[PDB]
């Protein structure tokens, strides 16, 4: 069986610059003058899409900024110039023997200018409270880079138990990330405190971005 190893695991390239990623085969994928190596692109929530076949051939319909090169055990995929829509994970794939196998994938991040998050906080819905539950939700939207920290405070005291965080994949148009942070409490405990605060720490601003509310009628 031929094993494919891709490098790097991830890379970040600015809009309009050049990306090259690599695929190394454990032994030759060459048969009678052709390299049986192929490249696929996968965007979030989509199936993979063929880009390059037999190492260097552009598939019909694929933009000409995509290219491939290599032979034997060493192959590259190049995107030049990179566009926002190229935010995706890329896979090499060989079929010089059965079984067909895939490399482990390389994630391309698009580098853009730093962007501060837009923060919004949401008390539990009336419907959730009537059901006996209480979740407080904080959205931290359209920021860059991806690293961010959220701190929850209840009546001014930090709370970490019961917080679930989730990041989107990178936006295919504006190259930002968003994240949701959900503090889940029992209704019993939610209704024994008055103030709820979501605090976002990001490199873009001094001041942490704070959104808060008081429980009231």
């Amino acid at each position: 069986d031929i094993v494919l190893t891709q490098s790097p695991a991830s890379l970040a390239a600015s809009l309009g610059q050049r990306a090259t990623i690599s695929c190394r085969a454990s032994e030759s994928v060459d048969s009678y003058g052709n390299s049986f190596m192929h490249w696929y692109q996968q965007k979030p929530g989509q199936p993979p899409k063929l880009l390059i076949y037999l190492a260097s051939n552009l598939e019909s319909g694929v933009p000409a900024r995509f290219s491939g090169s290599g032979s034997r055990t060493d192959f590259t995929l190049t995107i030049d110039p990179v566009e926002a829509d190229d935010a995706a994970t890329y896979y090499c794939q060989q079929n010089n023997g059965v079984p067909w196998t895939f490399g482990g994938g390389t994630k391309l991040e698009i580098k853009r200018a730093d962007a501060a998050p837009t923060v919004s906080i949401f008390p539990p819905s009336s419907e959730q409270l009537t059901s006996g539950g209480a979740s407080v939700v904080c959205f931290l939207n359209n920021f860059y880079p991806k690293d961010i920290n959220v701190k929850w405070k209840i009546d001014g005291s930090e709370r970490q138990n019961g917080v679930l965080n989730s990041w989107t994949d990178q936006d295919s148009k504006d190259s930002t990330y968003s994240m949701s942070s959900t503090l889940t409490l029992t209704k019993d405990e939610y209704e024994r405190h008055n103030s709820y605060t979501c605090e976002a720490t990001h490199k873009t601003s001094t001041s942490p971005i704070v959104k808060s509310f008081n429980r009231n009628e």
Binding site: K49, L50, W100, T118, P123, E127, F139, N141, T168
Partner: protein
């Protein structure tokens, strides 16, 4: 054109059966591949049934995997047994070229291998904190809580409202998933016009609409 259909959730003691229904080409002329992808992981080739009807397989899985087909029905079948929780994955079928590429792909079907039971979500509308409206923009939310297995699909205004939407990957907590989505619109859009989140959970055959109303 290639379309996968499968159980959604299977117990680890049972078998997995998935059907790939194809259109626009004939299985007498084209082979069909199976490929899977665990959550957050890479593509893994499962095997292939060629136009002529012979098969090749992933070496590590061959003892518990078989692929077959019915040319006259335009259907390709995958069956797996001796299941493991890391068989939880999106399962794709894809058209062969014979034998160079996978050029057309199905959208994939999610398979979860688990003894936990199907649970429909609660869907909660998230309106801003009680009162007028502060900004030139308003952000609304939808909280999809306590369901199993993945996936759910979520739209806003039946998919007509797509700009300014962020739908976040679900988080798993004690055998149940929770998912949220936000949508940001100009202040003149809401509350003067209706905004509704639409949620579908195929495993429980459930759909829920929630209109976002001011608190």
């Amino acid at each position: 054109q290639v379309k996968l259909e499968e159980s959604g959730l299977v117990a680890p003691s049972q078998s997995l059966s998935i059907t790939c229904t194809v259109s626009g080409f004939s299985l007498i002329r084209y082979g069909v591949h199976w490929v899977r992808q665990p959550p957050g992981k890479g593509l893994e080739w499962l095997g292939v049934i060629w136009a002529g009807g012979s098969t090749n397989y992933n070496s590590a899985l061959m003892s518990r995997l078989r692929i077959s087909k019915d040319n006259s029905k335009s259907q390709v079948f995958l069956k797996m047994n001796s299941l493991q929780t890391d068989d939880t994955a999106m399962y794709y079928c894809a058209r062969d070229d014979e034998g160079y590429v996978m050029d057309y792909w199905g959208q994939g079907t999610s398979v979860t291998v688990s003894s936990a039971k199907t649970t429909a979500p609660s869907v909660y509308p998230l309106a801003p904190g009680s009162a007028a409206q502060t900004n030139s923009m308003v952000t609304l939310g939808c909280l999809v809580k306590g369901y199993f297995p993945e996936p759910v699909t979520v739209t806003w205004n039946s998919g007509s409202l797509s700009s300014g939407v962020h739908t976040f990957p679900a988080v798993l907590q004690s055998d149940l998933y929770t998912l949220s989505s936000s949508v940001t619109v100009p202040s003149s859009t809401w509350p003067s016009e209706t905004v509704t989140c639409n949620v579908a959970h195929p495993a429980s055959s459930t759909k829920v609409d929630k209109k976002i109303v001011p608190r």
